[PDB]
Amino acid sequence: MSDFDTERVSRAVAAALVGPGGVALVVKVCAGLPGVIHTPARRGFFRCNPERIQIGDWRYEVAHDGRLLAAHMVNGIVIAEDALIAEAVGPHLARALGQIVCRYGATVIPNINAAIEVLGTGTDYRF
Numbered sequence: 335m336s337d338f339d340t341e342r343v344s345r346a347v348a349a350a351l352v353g354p355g356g357v358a359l360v361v362k363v364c365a366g367l368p369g370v371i372h373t374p375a376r377r378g379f380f381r382c383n384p385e386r387i388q389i390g391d392w393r394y395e396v397a398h399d400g401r402l403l404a405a406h407m408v409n410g411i412v413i414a415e416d417a418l419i420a421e422a423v424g425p426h427l428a429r430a431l432g433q434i435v436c437r438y439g440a441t442v443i444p445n446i447n448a449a450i451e452v453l454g455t456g457t458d459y460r461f
């Protein structure tokens with residue numbers, strides 16, 4: 335075959351890979367602390383997202399959307415524009431169970447938070 339794997343490998347990998355578990359260990363272990371971490375040259379994006387598919391990286395919108403820096407307020411659209419279509423992917427909670435820990439837990443968030451705060455500012459809003 336040109337791509338085949340057993341359930342444990344297939345599902346666990348799919349669920350994990352798609353869900354937060356796979357991405358959790360892969361990105362965590364690969365990246366090493368998601369809160370902190372910034373790369374220069376890149377497709378502008380791809381990785382470090384709340385269970386969102388790596389999409390939305392436009393050609394001409396980079397500045398418009400990537401206005402997060404100055405007009406940091408405007409980016410509010412980036413979420414107010416197409417989100418109403420993703421804001422239905424909530425059931426992912428059950429899958430995104432891990433979303434539960436950081437929700438009903440959260441540790442490697444408050445800490446990096448005090449730095450993030452410094453490393454960026456916090457001058458932002460999130461829901």
Ligand SMILES: *SCC1=CC(C)(C)N(O)C1(C)C
Nearest residue numbers: 360361362363364365380381
């Ligand atoms: S950290 C591993 C990783 C991240 C990303 C930039 C999405 N990649 O292409 C690899 C798989 C190398």
Ligand SMILES: *SCC1=CC(C)(C)N(O)C1(C)C
Nearest residue numbers: 371372378379380381382383
């Ligand atoms: S990891 C950098 C990054 C990309 C994008 C998905 C746009 N983000 O929300 C952050 C700022 C985490």
Ligand SMILES: *SCC1=CC(C)(C)N(O)C1(C)C
Nearest residue numbers: 432433434435436437440461
């Ligand atoms: S589980 C990730 C998370 C943390 C917090 C900031 C409390 N949240 O609202 C979500 C659930 C997105």
